[PDB]
């Protein structure tokens, strides 16, 4: 019955399943990558996330394939926004807002995202008091 990270991420996603991609104007009529990750953490985990990816990436320190965290923020090389971000849920799969299809769960095994994956950054503090 523990407050599981992936559980809460999917729990939040259950509300935004099918929403289209819109930069900045975060709502059920459209939401972007930074908008979606913002929403997820702000109302589920209660984390203070900003509005743009360039700000998001500086909220957490970077890691490699070995140090990936559940709920980690993975940055992708996307010319449309410069920096795209997705919520790493496990192995290579992550939930985010895709430009066309909308908010979905993609995989780093897919050639497009495999070359897109630049680095990962944990905005969640693993240590607690």
């Amino acid at each position: 019955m523990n407050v599981d990270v992936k559980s809460r991420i999917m729990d939040q996603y259950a509300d935004w399943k099918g929403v289209r991609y819109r930069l900045g104007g975060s709502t059920k009529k459209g939401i972007d990558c930074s908008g979606f990750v913002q929403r997820t953490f702000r109302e589920q985990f209660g984390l203070e996330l900003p509005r743009s990816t360039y700000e998001q990436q500086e909220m957490g320190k970077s890691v490699s394939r070995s140090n990936l965290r559940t709920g980690d923020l993975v940055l992708f090389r996307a010319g449309s926004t410069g920096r795209h971000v997705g919520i790493y849920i496990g192995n290579n799969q992550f939930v985010h807002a895709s430009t066309s299809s909308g908010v979905i769960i993609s995989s780093m095994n897919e050639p497009y995202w495999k070359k897109r994956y630049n680095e990962a950054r944990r905005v969640l503090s693993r240590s607690l008091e």
Side-chain angles (χ1 to χ4, degrees):
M1 313 309 177
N2 308 33
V3 184
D4 181 67
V5 182
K6 186 179 183 179
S7 172
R8 268 59 292 287
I9 302 175
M10 302 292 84
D11 190 273
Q12 179 62 28
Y13 177 46
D15 191 50
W16 298 80
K17 298 185 297 79
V19 182
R20 296 296 178 175
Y21 189 89
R22 179 175 180 146
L23 294 173
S26 302
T27 177
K28 292 294 180 62
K29 290 76 68 178
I31 189 173
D32 62 282
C33 59
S34 290
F36 180 70
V37 66
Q38 176 202 150
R39 291 297 310 216
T40 303
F41 290 74
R42 72 180 303 273
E43 62 191 302
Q44 293 294 330
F45 302 103
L47 186 62
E48 314 85 87
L49 294 186
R51 282 289 175 140
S52 295
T53 320
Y54 290 76
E55 306 174 288
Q56 297 287 28
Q57 69 181 331
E58 302 194 283
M59 301 301 297
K61 297 301 181 300
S62 61
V63 278
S64 181
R65 296 292 194 167
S66 56
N67 291 269
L68 296 178
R69 307 292 81 155
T70 304
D72 197 288
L73 301 193
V74 292
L75 301 171
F76 300 102
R77 303 169 178 120
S80 302
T81 63
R83 290 300 191 243
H84 187 90
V85 61
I87 308 175
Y88 177 84
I89 62 179
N91 308 274
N92 295 94
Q93 290 176 209
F94 47 92
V95 62
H96 67 117
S98 297
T99 59
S100 58
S101 300
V103 189
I104 63 176
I105 302 178
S106 300
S107 179
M108 299 176 184
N109 300 275
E110 302 181 88
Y112 190 83
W113 301 112
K114 185 168 58 180
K115 60 181 60 183
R116 248 57 167 129
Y117 179 60
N118 189 90
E119 63 188 82
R121 297 186 178 208
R122 53 268 165 78
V123 295
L124 296 176
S125 181
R126 188 273 178 135
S127 299
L128 62 162
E129 300 173 83

